[PDB]
DNA sequence: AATAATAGTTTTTAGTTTATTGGGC
DNA sequence: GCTAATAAACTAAAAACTATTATTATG
């Protein structure tokens, strides 16, 4: 299970990206079997093999109920391993490949589940929120940016805090290099701004954050920033 | 625990002896039990070994 | 790594090698082939990862892809396998010798340049890194290609050539009436840094014994067990190599393999929800320990942070006289540390200075040691071991510091020991006399594990399909009758001196 | 072992001879049926209230 | 459009399991 | 009559020591 296996995973992934509901149904059997081989708790697989998460990140079918009935189990496993990952107490806030894999998985699976209905929503918001330093074009922050952007709505009512910090972190990330990171930050930006505008419009407290947060920085915008500010 | 035995010397002498591991390594005398995360019990927690067919198959051997 | 080993074996396929001075003696063919069996068995025991080959010459056939006549390759440079051994055994002995001579030619003219060509090509084929371009052959003649001056010239030219390419060759003396005529034709053609110009050696005179002897050791390469750092003052930190000169042995892993295929089965073992028959999750795992009433629940990173005390490293605790440790404060087998300059350069200078000083000081280096992550630290003493040499100036002891381990208070288990009892000096003299009777000069390498050796015997006899497993000889059995004759009546003399003659030491 | 005071006196004489001659005894130890017999070194340990020998395992080649 | 940081290779190594005399009346 | 150490064999477990290569720079 190596570059051969990894390339095979990439192949079937791009297949499912192309193929949509012609023979996308002999997957539930396969879905169960990848859950089982992932339920092989042996640490034998390499971190690169953890791209298996993108494998289980699924959108090529209607995802019959059993897919959902196991998806939350997958989610909980990923949350636990993330709790392990960020704890720099293991000397590692590290998860070299894991982050993007679980990002893609939750991207494809949150489409079916997990609107704002509970604390777990805020929990996953937080695990994303911890997003210190990276290396080699800094893929993990971009992964987090895309993940949030696709499901910004499922994060409402818990983005109403730290907005100053979230905002400035977004600004620096798009200001940073690796234009892929820039555009990921852009997308996350617009998703966040739309969502916060929506929540503010329906508030009764809109005035507080309104007059305390926006026109000052909007004036202060005066490269690409202005254009975003224009939308803002 | 002592080692009551008889040291044999050559072919005609034997000495009853009592050995003792006076110096010893340090290891915990209480093992760690991995119970369930919900029942908090290990009874539902037991292993299933599979010797999946080493050929192009997965049947347990 | 620093390279691997390469070696090929060559045999003169001629009637002069199937004969003997007296035919009761083995033919050079037969002794050579059994020595090859021995060598391959030693490799399989020790370093079967190396690559081994066999080729013929003088036979009236050739199998080399070069297709030069009489140059018949037998095997390419391959790891020693039992199949190869059987291929050798079918013609080993002076009946398989005849069978070989039937199915295979034997005895013909050729030039040594051909065999040198084919062996050079075989070396060139393998893409790996070989630290030794060793060449082995078996013959006891130097004349047939010195017979033709052109053949001698080309052979020596190619010999110098392969020496230029760093190829090494060696020949064992084979049993001849006349011999290979030392320095007549092989004193420059052979890459030698030694001298044995004392006899044409018509008789065999070589290291064949060691070649036919079988060592039972793995002799793994030299690896840095660790390059871990010393935290001298938490500012000055040194890089040093970690090694042991001795490692407790083991047994090869039991390869579980399927019945009617002999194929090792890929095996996956996992836990599952026994309450429902479902399959568990790594999150489902909850670490627990019951004490009296409450069972206490902990996690993995919790289980390691309690094991986490400090970074992997060495923390110098101070100086302590070497005499301030008694050998009965022994712990797991001692280790050794060598200086290194991989990151901390100049640190070897410090190591030498401190070695010399504490040798003059006659004190040990007490340190606090954490091997690895999430490992508690322990008290460790560093005795300065001096580089000890011999007549050949070989490091019978290398320089550096032997690493010994300090048992803790809990490590002590004070027995319910009784009082102290003396003895008469005449009994002490009896004991001194008996000791001098059975005095034995110590020698470390004079012993092996009989279980290890016998399990080997089983293993290689199994692969070799022997008429019996080899009867491994236990060096640890004391020759009881030898001590009886070496002592005489001193045994019973001291027995009646101490033991009441009516009272046997048996209850 | 206890109740063999003759063996106790013999062991004491052994210890005294080892001290005087600076000998150390090379011995073969076999813990039980299923423990591998092996070689170790035995040297005396002396305290005011007890004299004893100390066994330390030794390696092979 | 080049160089670079990063993979398990074995190899030890350190918990586990067992089948082992032992205190009991 | 009950059931406790126990070293042996057996697991996983991390580092050495690999060899490989996405990188940025730059045209």
Short mmCIF file of N, CA, C and O in Angstrom, two decimals, chain A residues 114-222:
data_model
loop_
_atom_site.label_atom_id
_atom_site.label_comp_id
_atom_site.label_asym_id
_atom_site.label_seq_id
_atom_site.Cartn_x
_atom_site.Cartn_y
_atom_site.Cartn_z
N UNK A 114 -25.30 18.03 9.50
CA UNK A 114 -24.65 18.97 10.41
C UNK A 114 -24.92 20.43 10.05
O UNK A 114 -24.02 21.21 9.74
N UNK A 115 -26.20 20.79 10.11
CA UNK A 115 -26.56 22.20 10.21
C UNK A 115 -26.45 22.64 11.66
O UNK A 115 -26.29 21.82 12.57
N UNK A 116 -26.55 23.95 11.89
CA UNK A 116 -26.46 24.44 13.26
C UNK A 116 -27.65 23.94 14.05
O UNK A 116 -28.76 24.46 13.93
N UNK A 117 -27.42 22.92 14.87
CA UNK A 117 -28.46 22.35 15.71
C UNK A 117 -27.97 21.97 17.09
O UNK A 117 -28.75 21.43 17.88
N UNK A 118 -26.70 22.23 17.42
CA UNK A 118 -26.08 21.60 18.58
C UNK A 118 -24.71 22.22 18.80
O UNK A 118 -24.22 23.01 17.99
N UNK A 119 -24.10 21.85 19.92
CA UNK A 119 -22.73 22.22 20.26
C UNK A 119 -21.70 21.65 19.29
O UNK A 119 -20.78 22.37 18.91
N UNK A 120 -21.79 20.34 18.90
CA UNK A 120 -20.79 19.78 17.97
C UNK A 120 -20.44 20.69 16.81
O UNK A 120 -19.30 20.71 16.34
N UNK A 121 -21.43 21.44 16.34
CA UNK A 121 -21.17 22.46 15.33
C UNK A 121 -20.11 23.43 15.82
O UNK A 121 -19.10 23.67 15.14
N UNK A 122 -20.31 23.99 17.01
CA UNK A 122 -19.33 24.91 17.57
C UNK A 122 -18.01 24.22 17.82
O UNK A 122 -16.94 24.82 17.65
N UNK A 123 -18.05 22.95 18.21
CA UNK A 123 -16.83 22.20 18.44
C UNK A 123 -15.98 22.15 17.18
O UNK A 123 -14.80 22.51 17.19
N UNK A 124 -16.59 21.71 16.07
CA UNK A 124 -15.83 21.62 14.83
C UNK A 124 -15.39 23.00 14.36
O UNK A 124 -14.27 23.15 13.85
N UNK A 125 -16.23 24.02 14.57
CA UNK A 125 -15.78 25.38 14.33
C UNK A 125 -14.48 25.64 15.07
O UNK A 125 -13.51 26.12 14.48
N UNK A 126 -14.41 25.26 16.35
CA UNK A 126 -13.23 25.56 17.15
C UNK A 126 -12.01 24.81 16.63
O UNK A 126 -10.92 25.39 16.48
N UNK A 127 -12.16 23.50 16.36
CA UNK A 127 -11.00 22.76 15.88
C UNK A 127 -10.46 23.39 14.61
O UNK A 127 -9.24 23.46 14.41
N UNK A 128 -11.34 23.87 13.74
CA UNK A 128 -10.85 24.65 12.62
C UNK A 128 -10.20 25.95 13.10
O UNK A 128 -9.16 26.36 12.57
N UNK A 129 -10.78 26.58 14.12
CA UNK A 129 -10.38 27.92 14.52
C UNK A 129 -8.94 27.97 14.97
O UNK A 129 -8.28 29.01 14.83
N UNK A 130 -8.43 26.86 15.51
CA UNK A 130 -7.07 26.88 16.04
C UNK A 130 -6.06 27.21 14.94
O UNK A 130 -4.92 27.58 15.24
N UNK A 131 -6.46 27.08 13.68
CA UNK A 131 -5.64 27.44 12.54
C UNK A 131 -5.05 28.83 12.67
O UNK A 131 -5.67 29.72 13.24
N UNK A 132 -0.80 28.45 13.51
CA UNK A 132 0.51 28.75 14.08
C UNK A 132 1.56 28.95 12.99
O UNK A 132 1.96 30.08 12.72
N UNK A 133 2.01 27.86 12.37
CA UNK A 133 2.99 27.93 11.29
C UNK A 133 2.91 26.65 10.48
O UNK A 133 2.55 25.59 11.00
N UNK A 134 3.23 26.75 9.19
CA UNK A 134 3.19 25.62 8.27
C UNK A 134 4.46 25.67 7.42
O UNK A 134 5.38 26.45 7.68
N UNK A 135 4.52 24.81 6.39
CA UNK A 135 5.69 24.69 5.55
C UNK A 135 5.28 24.15 4.19
O UNK A 135 4.22 23.55 4.03
N UNK A 136 6.15 24.39 3.20
CA UNK A 136 6.00 23.86 1.84
C UNK A 136 4.65 24.24 1.25
O UNK A 136 3.77 23.41 1.00
N UNK A 137 4.49 25.55 1.06
CA UNK A 137 3.34 26.19 0.43
C UNK A 137 2.08 26.13 1.29
O UNK A 137 1.01 26.55 0.83
N UNK A 138 2.18 25.62 2.52
CA UNK A 138 1.18 25.85 3.57
C UNK A 138 -0.21 25.37 3.13
O UNK A 138 -1.16 26.14 3.01
N UNK A 139 -0.30 24.06 2.89
CA UNK A 139 -1.53 23.50 2.33
C UNK A 139 -2.65 23.46 3.36
O UNK A 139 -3.82 23.69 3.02
N UNK A 140 -2.32 23.16 4.62
CA UNK A 140 -3.35 22.97 5.64
C UNK A 140 -4.21 24.22 5.83
O UNK A 140 -5.45 24.08 5.93
N UNK A 141 -3.65 25.43 5.95
CA UNK A 141 -4.54 26.60 6.06
C UNK A 141 -5.48 26.74 4.89
O UNK A 141 -6.66 27.06 5.08
N UNK A 142 -5.00 26.48 3.67
CA UNK A 142 -5.87 26.54 2.50
C UNK A 142 -6.98 25.51 2.60
O UNK A 142 -8.14 25.79 2.25
N UNK A 143 -6.65 24.30 3.05
CA UNK A 143 -7.67 23.27 3.23
C UNK A 143 -8.74 23.75 4.19
O UNK A 143 -9.94 23.64 3.91
N UNK A 144 -8.32 24.31 5.32
CA UNK A 144 -9.29 24.84 6.27
C UNK A 144 -10.15 25.93 5.67
O UNK A 144 -11.35 26.01 5.93
N UNK A 145 -9.54 26.79 4.86
CA UNK A 145 -10.27 27.89 4.23
C UNK A 145 -11.36 27.36 3.31
O UNK A 145 -12.52 27.80 3.40
N UNK A 146 -11.01 26.43 2.43
CA UNK A 146 -12.02 25.83 1.56
C UNK A 146 -13.11 25.16 2.38
O UNK A 146 -14.31 25.34 2.11
N UNK A 147 -12.71 24.39 3.39
CA UNK A 147 -13.68 23.67 4.20
C UNK A 147 -14.69 24.62 4.83
O UNK A 147 -15.90 24.39 4.76
N UNK A 148 -14.21 25.70 5.42
CA UNK A 148 -15.13 26.66 6.01
C UNK A 148 -15.98 27.33 4.95
O UNK A 148 -17.19 27.52 5.14
N UNK A 149 -15.38 27.69 3.81
CA UNK A 149 -16.10 28.42 2.79
C UNK A 149 -17.27 27.62 2.25
O UNK A 149 -18.37 28.15 2.05
N UNK A 150 -17.07 26.32 2.03
CA UNK A 150 -18.14 25.50 1.48
C UNK A 150 -19.32 25.40 2.44
O UNK A 150 -20.47 25.35 2.00
N UNK A 151 -19.06 25.38 3.74
CA UNK A 151 -20.11 25.20 4.74
C UNK A 151 -20.05 26.31 5.78
O UNK A 151 -20.09 26.08 6.99
N UNK A 152 -19.96 27.55 5.30
CA UNK A 152 -19.98 28.69 6.21
C UNK A 152 -21.30 28.78 6.95
O UNK A 152 -21.34 29.13 8.14
N UNK A 153 -22.40 28.47 6.26
CA UNK A 153 -23.72 28.56 6.88
C UNK A 153 -23.83 27.64 8.09
O UNK A 153 -24.40 28.01 9.12
N UNK A 154 -23.29 26.43 7.97
CA UNK A 154 -23.33 25.47 9.07
C UNK A 154 -22.48 25.89 10.24
O UNK A 154 -22.32 25.10 11.18
N UNK A 155 -21.89 27.08 10.20
CA UNK A 155 -21.07 27.60 11.28
C UNK A 155 -21.67 28.84 11.92
O UNK A 155 -21.03 29.43 12.81
N UNK A 156 -22.86 29.26 11.51
CA UNK A 156 -23.47 30.48 12.01
C UNK A 156 -23.67 30.40 13.52
O UNK A 156 -23.49 29.36 14.15
N UNK A 157 -24.03 31.55 14.11
CA UNK A 157 -24.39 31.65 15.52
C UNK A 157 -23.26 31.23 16.44
O UNK A 157 -23.43 31.18 17.66
N UNK A 158 -22.10 30.91 15.87
CA UNK A 158 -20.88 30.71 16.63
C UNK A 158 -19.70 31.41 15.98
O UNK A 158 -18.58 31.33 16.51
N UNK A 159 -19.91 32.08 14.85
CA UNK A 159 -18.94 32.97 14.25
C UNK A 159 -19.10 34.40 14.73
O UNK A 159 -18.29 35.26 14.38
N UNK A 160 -20.12 34.66 15.55
CA UNK A 160 -20.42 35.99 16.06
C UNK A 160 -19.40 36.46 17.09
O UNK A 160 -19.49 37.60 17.55
N UNK A 161 -18.47 35.60 17.47
CA UNK A 161 -17.39 35.93 18.37
C UNK A 161 -16.07 35.85 17.62
O UNK A 161 -15.99 35.27 16.54
N UNK A 162 -15.04 36.47 18.20
CA UNK A 162 -13.69 36.47 17.66
C UNK A 162 -13.62 37.07 16.27
O UNK A 162 -12.60 36.94 15.59
N UNK A 163 -14.69 37.74 15.84
CA UNK A 163 -14.78 38.24 14.47
C UNK A 163 -13.59 39.13 14.13
O UNK A 163 -13.12 39.12 12.99
N UNK A 164 -13.12 39.90 15.10
CA UNK A 164 -11.92 40.70 14.87
C UNK A 164 -10.75 39.80 14.50
O UNK A 164 -10.07 40.02 13.49
N UNK A 165 -10.53 38.75 15.29
CA UNK A 165 -9.41 37.86 15.06
C UNK A 165 -9.59 37.06 13.78
O UNK A 165 -8.66 36.93 12.98
N UNK A 166 -10.79 36.52 13.57
CA UNK A 166 -11.07 35.79 12.34
C UNK A 166 -10.79 36.67 11.13
O UNK A 166 -10.13 36.25 10.17
N UNK A 167 -11.27 37.91 11.19
CA UNK A 167 -11.11 38.86 10.10
C UNK A 167 -9.64 39.12 9.81
O UNK A 167 -9.20 38.99 8.67
N UNK A 168 -8.87 39.48 10.84
CA UNK A 168 -7.47 39.81 10.59
C UNK A 168 -6.67 38.60 10.15
O UNK A 168 -5.74 38.73 9.34
N UNK A 169 -6.98 37.42 10.69
CA UNK A 169 -6.31 36.20 10.24
C UNK A 169 -6.60 35.96 8.77
O UNK A 169 -5.70 35.60 8.00
N UNK A 170 -7.84 36.17 8.35
CA UNK A 170 -8.16 36.06 6.94
C UNK A 170 -7.36 37.06 6.12
O UNK A 170 -6.81 36.72 5.07
N UNK A 171 -7.27 38.30 6.61
CA UNK A 171 -6.55 39.33 5.87
C UNK A 171 -5.09 38.95 5.68
O UNK A 171 -4.55 39.07 4.57
N UNK A 172 -4.44 38.50 6.74
CA UNK A 172 -3.04 38.12 6.60
C UNK A 172 -2.90 36.92 5.69
O UNK A 172 -2.01 36.89 4.83
N UNK A 173 -3.80 35.93 5.81
CA UNK A 173 -3.66 34.73 5.00
C UNK A 173 -3.77 35.04 3.52
O UNK A 173 -2.97 34.55 2.71
N UNK A 174 -4.75 35.86 3.13
CA UNK A 174 -4.80 36.26 1.73
C UNK A 174 -3.63 37.16 1.38
O UNK A 174 -3.12 37.10 0.25
N UNK A 175 -3.17 37.98 2.32
CA UNK A 175 -1.98 38.79 2.09
C UNK A 175 -0.73 37.93 1.94
O UNK A 175 0.23 38.38 1.32
N UNK A 176 -0.74 36.72 2.48
CA UNK A 176 0.42 35.86 2.38
C UNK A 176 0.59 35.35 0.95
O UNK A 176 -0.26 35.55 0.08
N UNK A 177 1.70 34.66 0.73
CA UNK A 177 2.06 34.17 -0.59
C UNK A 177 1.25 32.92 -0.92
O UNK A 177 0.24 32.62 -0.28
N UNK A 178 1.68 32.18 -1.95
CA UNK A 178 1.03 30.94 -2.37
C UNK A 178 -0.41 31.19 -2.80
O UNK A 178 -1.37 30.82 -2.14
N UNK A 179 -0.53 31.85 -3.96
CA UNK A 179 -1.78 32.40 -4.48
C UNK A 179 -2.96 31.45 -4.32
O UNK A 179 -4.11 31.88 -4.26
N UNK A 180 -2.68 30.14 -4.25
CA UNK A 180 -3.71 29.19 -3.86
C UNK A 180 -4.23 29.51 -2.46
O UNK A 180 -5.44 29.53 -2.23
N UNK A 181 -3.31 29.77 -1.53
CA UNK A 181 -3.70 30.22 -0.20
C UNK A 181 -4.45 31.54 -0.27
O UNK A 181 -5.43 31.75 0.45
N UNK A 182 -3.99 32.46 -1.13
CA UNK A 182 -4.67 33.74 -1.27
C UNK A 182 -6.12 33.54 -1.67
O UNK A 182 -7.02 34.08 -1.03
N UNK A 183 -6.37 32.76 -2.72
CA UNK A 183 -7.73 32.59 -3.21
C UNK A 183 -8.58 31.78 -2.24
O UNK A 183 -9.78 32.02 -2.12
N UNK A 184 -7.97 30.81 -1.54
CA UNK A 184 -8.71 30.12 -0.49
C UNK A 184 -9.16 31.09 0.59
O UNK A 184 -10.31 31.05 1.04
N UNK A 185 -8.26 32.00 0.99
CA UNK A 185 -8.62 33.01 1.97
C UNK A 185 -9.69 33.93 1.43
O UNK A 185 -10.60 34.33 2.16
N UNK A 186 -9.60 34.28 0.14
CA UNK A 186 -10.64 35.11 -0.47
C UNK A 186 -12.00 34.44 -0.35
O UNK A 186 -12.96 35.05 0.12
N UNK A 187 -12.08 33.18 -0.77
CA UNK A 187 -13.35 32.45 -0.75
C UNK A 187 -13.90 32.37 0.67
O UNK A 187 -15.09 32.64 0.91
N UNK A 188 -13.05 32.00 1.62
CA UNK A 188 -13.47 31.98 3.02
C UNK A 188 -13.95 33.35 3.45
O UNK A 188 -14.94 33.47 4.18
N UNK A 189 -13.27 34.40 3.00
CA UNK A 189 -13.67 35.76 3.33
C UNK A 189 -15.09 36.03 2.88
O UNK A 189 -15.93 36.43 3.69
N UNK A 190 -15.38 35.80 1.60
CA UNK A 190 -16.71 36.16 1.11
C UNK A 190 -17.78 35.32 1.78
O UNK A 190 -18.86 35.83 2.11
N UNK A 191 -17.51 34.03 1.99
CA UNK A 191 -18.47 33.20 2.70
C UNK A 191 -18.75 33.76 4.09
O UNK A 191 -19.91 33.91 4.49
N UNK A 192 -17.69 34.12 4.81
CA UNK A 192 -17.84 34.65 6.16
C UNK A 192 -18.63 35.96 6.15
O UNK A 192 -19.52 36.15 6.97
N UNK A 193 -18.29 36.86 5.23
CA UNK A 193 -18.97 38.15 5.18
C UNK A 193 -20.44 37.98 4.85
O UNK A 193 -21.29 38.63 5.46
N UNK A 194 -20.76 37.12 3.89
CA UNK A 194 -22.16 36.89 3.56
C UNK A 194 -22.90 36.34 4.77
O UNK A 194 -23.99 36.82 5.11
N UNK A 195 -22.31 35.36 5.45
CA UNK A 195 -22.99 34.73 6.57
C UNK A 195 -23.21 35.73 7.71
O UNK A 195 -24.29 35.78 8.31
N UNK A 196 -22.19 36.54 8.01
CA UNK A 196 -22.34 37.50 9.10
C UNK A 196 -23.32 38.60 8.72
O UNK A 196 -24.07 39.08 9.57
N UNK A 197 -23.34 39.00 7.45
CA UNK A 197 -24.36 39.95 7.01
C UNK A 197 -25.75 39.38 7.21
O UNK A 197 -26.66 40.07 7.68
N UNK A 198 -25.92 38.10 6.87
CA UNK A 198 -27.23 37.47 7.04
C UNK A 198 -27.63 37.45 8.50
O UNK A 198 -28.76 37.83 8.84
N UNK A 199 -26.72 37.04 9.38
CA UNK A 199 -27.09 36.98 10.80
C UNK A 199 -27.36 38.38 11.34
O UNK A 199 -28.28 38.57 12.15
N UNK A 200 -26.58 39.37 10.91
CA UNK A 200 -26.75 40.73 11.41
C UNK A 200 -28.09 41.30 10.97
O UNK A 200 -28.77 41.98 11.74
N UNK A 201 -28.48 41.03 9.72
CA UNK A 201 -29.73 41.58 9.20
C UNK A 201 -30.92 41.14 10.04
O UNK A 201 -31.86 41.91 10.25
N UNK A 202 -30.91 39.90 10.52
CA UNK A 202 -32.02 39.36 11.28
C UNK A 202 -31.87 39.56 12.78
O UNK A 202 -32.73 39.11 13.54
N UNK A 203 -30.82 40.23 13.23
CA UNK A 203 -30.60 40.44 14.65
C UNK A 203 -31.55 41.50 15.19
O UNK A 203 -32.43 42.01 14.50
N UNK A 204 -31.38 41.79 16.48
CA UNK A 204 -31.79 43.05 17.08
C UNK A 204 -30.60 43.80 17.64
O UNK A 204 -30.72 45.00 17.93
N UNK A 205 -29.46 43.13 17.80
CA UNK A 205 -28.22 43.70 18.29
C UNK A 205 -27.31 44.18 17.16
O UNK A 205 -26.15 44.50 17.42
N UNK A 206 -27.82 44.22 15.93
CA UNK A 206 -26.97 44.48 14.77
C UNK A 206 -26.18 45.76 14.94
O UNK A 206 -25.05 45.87 14.44
N UNK A 207 -26.75 46.73 15.65
CA UNK A 207 -26.12 48.04 15.80
C UNK A 207 -24.77 47.94 16.49
O UNK A 207 -23.83 48.64 16.11
N UNK A 208 -24.67 47.09 17.50
CA UNK A 208 -23.46 47.00 18.30
C UNK A 208 -22.25 46.69 17.42
O UNK A 208 -21.38 47.55 17.24
N UNK A 209 -22.24 45.49 16.84
CA UNK A 209 -21.14 45.11 15.97
C UNK A 209 -21.06 46.01 14.75
O UNK A 209 -19.96 46.32 14.27
N UNK A 210 -22.22 46.46 14.25
CA UNK A 210 -22.26 47.35 13.10
C UNK A 210 -21.37 48.56 13.31
O UNK A 210 -20.33 48.72 12.66
N UNK A 211 -21.75 49.41 14.27
CA UNK A 211 -21.02 50.65 14.49
C UNK A 211 -19.69 50.43 15.19
O UNK A 211 -18.83 51.31 15.13
N UNK A 212 -19.49 49.29 15.83
CA UNK A 212 -18.26 49.04 16.55
C UNK A 212 -17.23 48.26 15.75
O UNK A 212 -16.14 48.00 16.26
N UNK A 213 -17.54 47.88 14.51
CA UNK A 213 -16.65 46.93 13.86
C UNK A 213 -16.25 47.28 12.43
O UNK A 213 -15.13 46.97 12.02
N UNK A 214 -17.11 47.94 11.67
CA UNK A 214 -17.03 47.85 10.22
C UNK A 214 -16.56 49.12 9.53
O UNK A 214 -15.56 49.07 8.80
N UNK A 215 -17.23 50.25 9.73
CA UNK A 215 -16.87 51.43 8.94
C UNK A 215 -15.44 51.88 9.21
O UNK A 215 -14.80 52.46 8.33
N UNK A 216 -14.92 51.59 10.41
CA UNK A 216 -13.55 51.99 10.71
C UNK A 216 -12.55 51.24 9.84
O UNK A 216 -11.74 51.84 9.13
N UNK A 217 -12.63 49.90 9.84
CA UNK A 217 -11.73 49.12 9.01
C UNK A 217 -12.02 49.34 7.53
O UNK A 217 -11.09 49.35 6.71
N UNK A 218 -13.29 49.54 7.18
CA UNK A 218 -13.64 49.80 5.79
C UNK A 218 -12.98 51.07 5.29
O UNK A 218 -12.44 51.10 4.18
N UNK A 219 -13.00 52.13 6.10
CA UNK A 219 -12.22 53.32 5.78
C UNK A 219 -10.74 52.99 5.70
O UNK A 219 -10.03 53.45 4.80
N UNK A 220 -10.26 52.17 6.64
CA UNK A 220 -8.84 51.86 6.71
C UNK A 220 -8.31 51.04 5.56
O UNK A 220 -7.09 50.98 5.37
N UNK A 221 -9.19 50.41 4.78
CA UNK A 221 -8.73 49.64 3.63
C UNK A 221 -7.97 50.55 2.67
O UNK A 221 -6.96 50.15 2.08
N UNK A 222 -8.45 51.77 2.50
CA UNK A 222 -7.80 52.75 1.63
C UNK A 222 -6.40 53.05 2.15
O UNK A 222 -6.21 53.23 3.35
#
